[PDB]
Write a protein that binds this DNA or RNA. Sequence first.
RNA 1: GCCUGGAGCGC
DNA 2: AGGCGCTCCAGGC
Length: 865
Amino acid sequence: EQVFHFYWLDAYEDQYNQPGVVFLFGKVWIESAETHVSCCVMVKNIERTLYFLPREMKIDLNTGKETGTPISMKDVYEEFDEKIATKYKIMKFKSKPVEKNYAFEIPDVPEKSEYLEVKYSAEMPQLPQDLKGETFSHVFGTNTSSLELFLMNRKIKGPCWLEVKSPQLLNQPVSWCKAEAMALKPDLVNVIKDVSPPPLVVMAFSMKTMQNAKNHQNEIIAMAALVHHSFALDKAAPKPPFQSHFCVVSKPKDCIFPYAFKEVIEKKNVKVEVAATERTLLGFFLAKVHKIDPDIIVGHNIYGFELEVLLQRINVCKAPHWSKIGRLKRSNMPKLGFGERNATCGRMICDVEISAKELIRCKSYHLSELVQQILKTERVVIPMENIQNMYSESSQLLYLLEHTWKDAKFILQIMCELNVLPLALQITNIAGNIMSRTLMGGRSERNEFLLLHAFYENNYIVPDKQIRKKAAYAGGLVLDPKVGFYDKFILLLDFNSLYPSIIQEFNICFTTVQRVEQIPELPDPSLEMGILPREIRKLVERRKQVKQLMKQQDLNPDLILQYDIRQKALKLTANSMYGCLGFSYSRFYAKPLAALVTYKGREILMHTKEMVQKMNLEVIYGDTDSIMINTNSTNLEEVFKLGNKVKSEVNKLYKLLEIDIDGVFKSLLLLKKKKYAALVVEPTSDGNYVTKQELKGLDIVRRDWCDLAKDTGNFVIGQILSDQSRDTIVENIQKRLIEIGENVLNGSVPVSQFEINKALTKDPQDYPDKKSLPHVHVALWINSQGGRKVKAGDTVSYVICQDGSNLTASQRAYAPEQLQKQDNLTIDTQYYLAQQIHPVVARICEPIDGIDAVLIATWLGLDPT
RNA sequence: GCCUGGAGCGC
DNA sequence: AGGCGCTCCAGGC
Ligand SMILES: C[C@@]1(CO)[C@H](O)CC[C@@]2(C)[C@H]1CC[C@H]1C[C@@H]3C[C@@]12CC[C@]3(O)CO
């Protein structure tokens, strides 16, 4: 008849105003224009689907007793037809008996069983979730959304190509896309899998807001954006990351642009559009968004500030057509990211801050710390105050705009550097969810979707969607450490994905483990692979295919970064599978399964520790899935043969679980459980090797210890692991420490190294014992004093100062700025030497002969007692 | 040691 | 807006 193709990226549903309809936004190829343009496809008539569970025996709801008559499918039909449909207003519907499996948390529901499937328009009323009757004890699917029913039934798993048959035109345009179309029923949409992903339109932006002179509004005075119209998600980022860009500045209401501004620009030839009013600016922006038509908008702290601000201002200034910031034509703007995630429907939002938190560790995720760590460059800062003063001289405004441009360019580079977009696609293509959601973070949901697809495809009824804490079960086993320094090589054996393998090994699934604190029994080896095991099995196969492809030759060179990305996404998925089992709010929550996994975990660890011991080998440490062996040897080649020897022995015990040589140490300083320092062997040629320092858990790697303490401690660590004689070392450490103590007293240590960082678990206002907590105290100051406001998740930087108020150190906390700018404030040198440096060095040198607590305190110039 | 509150490393 | 195990600090009993 007729058909068109399109690559979908995002989906949206308005249950309240447009039930039974799902809007899909993506890309269509236009041959005439030789480029892809945005497209919106409206899918209608996605019907509610219910599953009524027939009773074994008919019940009288008044007496609560069987009536002697057994139940047949027809009984359910009739009760629904006569008493249910009527009472709740359902004119039409289709029904049909179907067989469905079940394996979830509602008791008295058979593993397999017949059900009365009832399908009817989403426009007619929704039944109560607890609805019961004379012929049925429960009904599933009452609250299932259309998006879920559509994605599950059509087997759509993340962005991909769709074939839409019998497309229809619309009276009037419903979206801001270049092409629109409508499908009358969902079975008109099909997935096609042998066509590559089209490149997207990416737009990175940043803005500068300014607090208004009189009262408290935060106006947008400048916006910068970088853009690229052909950004592949299946290959390396384009160089450069953008092709075009634009800048728009405005002025608050008390200020006036510096004289000659327009002219100063005409000269420099900068694409800076100078707008008279904030409202004009906003409108300029919204139009570029509408004209550029990005598929993805990337920024920093978008969901935490920028986006909400942009929307509020758009409303106050009554800027024209706010819904263009999204892809669907809408009238009313919802607020508070709910109203936000909805505000941009059709366009994916990538917030680098969120993406960084999921990909790397830092002491803070502010743009400057990310730029430093990720891009390795310094990023200037502009305090909200200095802004106005910049409106007096043109060269200053131009600097401000240029800065904003630099910010958007950094955000774009970070996004490129972390490979966020390509990873997100692979992740979404695996979980089978929605990419804008994958980008918002939250693993539980990617997990839900993956399982929902798995169970749907295997004929199971699935759970209805339902409408730090203290541990709820046993975790991993942590062997007791034989603290101390070692000179002989150390063997580190590791299991490859213990948890995921445990799950396949012992066939642990919702469909195989009987369950009701009490670890359930493993299933009988006779039963077939459970649904969950098969899913992990698949991830493991695909990851093997990929690593094998990577070993290939005469290959397209860029393909290797691609395989590497998919490989990691396949790993992240499999591992999250476990953690979801243990999440109380997960749609597929199942503590029993989780706990059974960690159990066989501990068990296997011990049988392993024991076995290495029966081989007359010393086992000095072990954490959840690893075993550290002290060979007492000095012959590297022999060490390896030993490892491979133990290896062969353990791997002989299982069908899928495998242990391997994760490495070898030349020297190791084991302080406590989950805390050590070591020199790692990196073989080269002829049995030779180089050595690299690796730290784990020591205060040195934490963010809640100033750099002064961390740098000193690392020094001591380098010494300790060295080749020098024990005495050479002990001397060097003393030499150094005493120096540090002086440098601290004389004031030669940079004010930066005294900074301590801590992240707030709650919003600074939700802390009762406030005052006694440094970071929280400092956060309140910052919030109540200036612009941006610290909130849960944010890391606060501070330093202890001499107030001259005789309060404990924990009550004399200030911001680095509050220190250098204020005079009566001065670094509490005493605190840092005794409460920072000393503690760290003390705990590191504990197993060291020659070094002691009182001995260290004197070197720094402290009274031993 | 424990308790209360608060940190974030480890797998 | 996936888990649990193991230190560290401030303060007081
Ligand atoms: C945090 C979480 C939750 O599943 C996530 O998948 C990252 C890996 C994770 C930390 C896991 C919790 C259990 C951890 C044990 C380690 C690391 C681990 C996943 C399994 C392990 O790799 C050992 O099997």
